[PDB]
Every structure is written in structure tokens, then in C-alpha cells.
Amino acid sequence: MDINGGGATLPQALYQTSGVLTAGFAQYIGVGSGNGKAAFLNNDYTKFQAGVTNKNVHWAGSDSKLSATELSTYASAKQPTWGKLIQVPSVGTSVAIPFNKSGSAAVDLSVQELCGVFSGRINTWDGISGSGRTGPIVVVYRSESSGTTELFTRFLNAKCNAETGNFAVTTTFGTSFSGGLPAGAVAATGSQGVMTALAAGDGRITYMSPDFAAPTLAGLDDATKVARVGKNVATNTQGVSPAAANVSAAIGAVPVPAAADRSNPDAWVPVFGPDNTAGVQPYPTSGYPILGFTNLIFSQCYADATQTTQVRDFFTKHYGASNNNDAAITANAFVPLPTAWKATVRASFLTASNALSIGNTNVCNGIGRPLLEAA
Numbered sequence: 001m002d003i004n005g006g007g008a009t010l011p012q013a014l015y016q017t018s019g020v021l022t023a024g025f026a027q028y029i030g031v032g033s034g035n036g037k038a039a040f041l042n043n044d045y046t047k048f049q050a051g052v053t054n055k056n057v058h059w060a061g062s063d064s065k066l067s068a069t070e071l072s073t074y075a076s077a078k079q080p081t082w083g084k085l086i087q088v089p090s091v092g093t094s095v096a097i098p099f100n101k102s103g104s105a106a107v108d109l110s111v112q113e114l115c116g117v118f119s120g121r122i123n124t125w126d127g128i129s130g131s132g133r134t135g136p137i138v139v140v141y142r143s144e145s146s147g148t149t150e151l152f153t154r155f156l157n158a159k160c161n162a163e164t165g166n167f168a169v170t171t172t173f174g175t176s177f178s179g180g181l182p183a184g185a186v187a188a189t190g191s192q193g194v195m196t197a198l199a200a201g202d203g204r205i206t207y208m209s210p211d212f213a214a215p216t217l218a219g220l221d222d223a224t225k226v227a228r229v230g231k232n233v234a235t236n237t238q239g240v241s242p243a244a245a246n247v248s249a250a251i252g253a254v255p256v257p258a259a260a261d262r263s264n265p266d267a268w269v270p271v272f273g274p275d276n277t278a279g280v281q282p283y284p285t286s287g288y289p290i291l292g293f294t295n296l297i298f299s300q301c302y303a304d305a306t307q308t309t310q311v312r313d314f315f316t317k318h319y320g321a322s323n324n325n326d327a328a329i330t331a332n333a334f335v336p337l338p339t340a341w342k343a344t345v346r347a348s349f350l351t352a353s354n355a356l357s358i359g360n361t362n363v364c365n366g367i368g369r370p371l372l373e374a375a
């Protein structure tokens with residue numbers, strides 16, 4: 001019998017790569033970050049497989065952080081019997097801007113053009129300078145509670161200061177902008193469902209996992225298909241692509257979680273945000289600007305000893321110095337964590353004497369998420 005994870009679609013092809021998940025892990029089920037969080041927090045397998053109730057949920061992938069309410073509800077309802085949850089970064093990621101509008105000219109968005117496209121202010125292809133293109137822009141967005149949406153709206157919230165309204169940080173893009181969606185915007189479900197929709201009408205644009213924004217990695221560098229971001233015509237500056245190499249320096253510069261705050265799951269997930277605001281990292285000035293982390297949610301404790309070992313063995317691989325998942329991470333258009341980040345994750349969640357460690361024989365004595373499923 002296996003343990004069950006799922007959630008965020010942004011990293012699902014990574015978790016579905018052979019060998020990334022270790023022994024005892026069922027194949028990852030991509031359903032969106034909101035569904036993944038709900039699956040874990042409520043131990044509700046139907047959020048992974050509709051109509052299927054005879055399994056427990058053991059972990060989730062999410063690119064949406066746990067909210068204050070999610071955390072407090074779990075702490076009061078579940079932690080006394082199941083133990084503390086763990087929320088940790090998995091990999092760093094860009095957010096790509098694929099589009100379906102032919103032409104050999106490179107599409108290179110200034111940040112303010114990106115803002116105007118997603119606010120509806122710029123709604124024709126000839127409103128993007130240097131595009132070579134004409135006709136209407138149709139924005140495709142995620143219908144459901146999405147961590148890609150959260151990562152993207154953090155950027156819009158930080159940068160888009162010149163619209164007729166403001167972008168809120170949210171998991172539901174349809175309500176992010178206080179002035180509404182652009183006329184004609186199209187909703188679709190999942191990373192893959194959005195990419196299918198992008199192709200279902202001409203002149204469409206979206207925001208997307210770099211692992212799905214192009215069929216091949218090198219395709220992230222094709223500016224006839226995946227927009228460059230960061231143009232500044234006044235200074236004669238080209239934007240760059242969402243390839244992992246263009247966000248990896250910025251990911252690597254993100255500070256490890258503050259030592260005295262490590263018992264708070266919120267402290268483990270870095271977020272980017274507005275400039276000169278303590279507690280959030282500013283978006284990078286160099287390289288590709290739209291980035292963040294995708295995360296993993298586990299329990300510290302499982303009533304079953306085999307489940308506990310299985311989970312530890314995954315952390316040993318995914319956060320290991322050797323025999324790790326970094327090659328697969330890169331192959332999936334993502335950024336590995338540096339050594340000091342891996343070491344910090346291991347020190348809290350693997351090293352046995354740490355109060356936070358998975359399966360700690362003192363802290364987890366007699367407790368943990370259940371073996372059997374109960375209705």
C-alpha cells in the first residue's frame with residue numbers, strides 16, 4: 001500500500017518523473033493547489049480523485065502558501081492528534097507568458113505592458129510595442145484556486161501601479177484585478193487545460209508553469225511563442241526569457257528561513273513582493289523578473305511506522321546532498337535549492353533530535369495521521 005499526494009499542476013510533470021518520488025509513493029495527482037491544500041488539511045481524497053473515498057491523503061504539492069486561517073484551523077483541529085504540518089519549498093520556478101499569435105518578430109513585454117495586458121488596458125497586439133502583430137488579445141486564466149495564479153498575482157501586485165485599479169494577491173485570477181477581467185477573457189482548468197485553450201483561438205495569452213509553457217525547454221527561448229519580459233525601449237534594454245537559467249541566481253540568493261521562526265510553517269516559504277518591504281524578497285533587477293517557489297506539505301507524524309519511513313526517505317532524496325532529484329528538477333524547467341537550503345531543511349525535518357523532525361520518537365509518540373480511512 002502506498003501513500004497519496006497531489007495538488008499543484010505547475011510541478012506535476014516533475015513529481016511524475018520516474019524516480020523523483022521514492023518507494024511507497026503513489027503517482028502524483030495534479031488537481032491544482034487549492035484542491036491539494038484542501039485534500040491535505042481535511043484528509044479528503046476526493047479532492048485528488050473525484051468519487052474515490054477509500055484512501056487517505058498523505059502530502060500535497062502547492063504553489064499557494066497556507067493561509068493564516070488554514071494554519072490555525074489545522075493547528076486546532078488536527079495537530080493534537082496528527083502532529084504539526086510541515087510546509088517547505090520544493091524548487092524555484094519562473095512564471096512564463098506563452099501566447100498563440102504567429103510572427104517572426106520577438107514579443108518582448110515591458111513590465112508595464114504585461115500589467116496592461118492582464119488588466120485589459122492593452123487589448124490589441126499592436127498595443128505591444130515592436131510586436132509585428134495586430135488584432136485582439138484574449139487573456140486565458142485559471143478558473144480554479146491556483147498556485148500559479150498566486151505566484152503571478154504577487155508580481156502584478158508588486159509592479160502594476162499604473163492601472164485603473166489594483167491587482168490583489170490571490171489564487172483566483174478572475175477576481176484579482178479590482179477593475180474586473182478583460183472583456184473576452186477565457187477561463188480554463190489546470191496548467192494543461194489552459195495550454196489547450198491557448199491553442200483553441202488565435203491571439204491568446206496566459207501565465208504558466210515553465211514546464212508546460214513550451215513543449216521543449218529551448219522553446220522557452222522562442223519569443224514567437226513565449227514572451228520575453230523586461231523590455232525598456234528608452235534604455236534600449238531587451239527583456240529575457242523565463243528559462244530556469246534566468247531565474248536561478250535570484251532563487252539562489254533567497255535567505256534560508258529565520259532560525260527562531262522555524263516552528264512556524266509560514267516562515268519556510270519565501271515570497272517575492274513589493275520593494276523595500278521587510279518579510280518579502282524584492283523581485284530581481286536582473287535576469288527574468290517573474291519567479292517564486294513551489295512547495296510541499298507533509299505531516300511531521302504518521303501513526304504508521306512504514307509511512308513515516310517512506311516520507312523520511314523521500315526527504316532524504318529530495319533534500320539530499322547526493323543522489324538527489326536536482327537533474328530531474330532542471331529537466332523540468334525548475335531551479336534546485338542550494339546546498340545551504342537543503343541542509344536547513346534536513347536539519348529541521350530529518351535530523352532526529354530536532355523538535356520538528358519527521359517521525360521524532362518523542363514528539364510523534366503515539367500520534368500522527370491515521371492508517372485506515374474513516375468516513
Ligand SMILES: O=P([O-])([O-])O
Nearest residue numbers: 009010033147148
Ligand atoms: O495548478 P497550480 O500549480 O496550483 O497552478
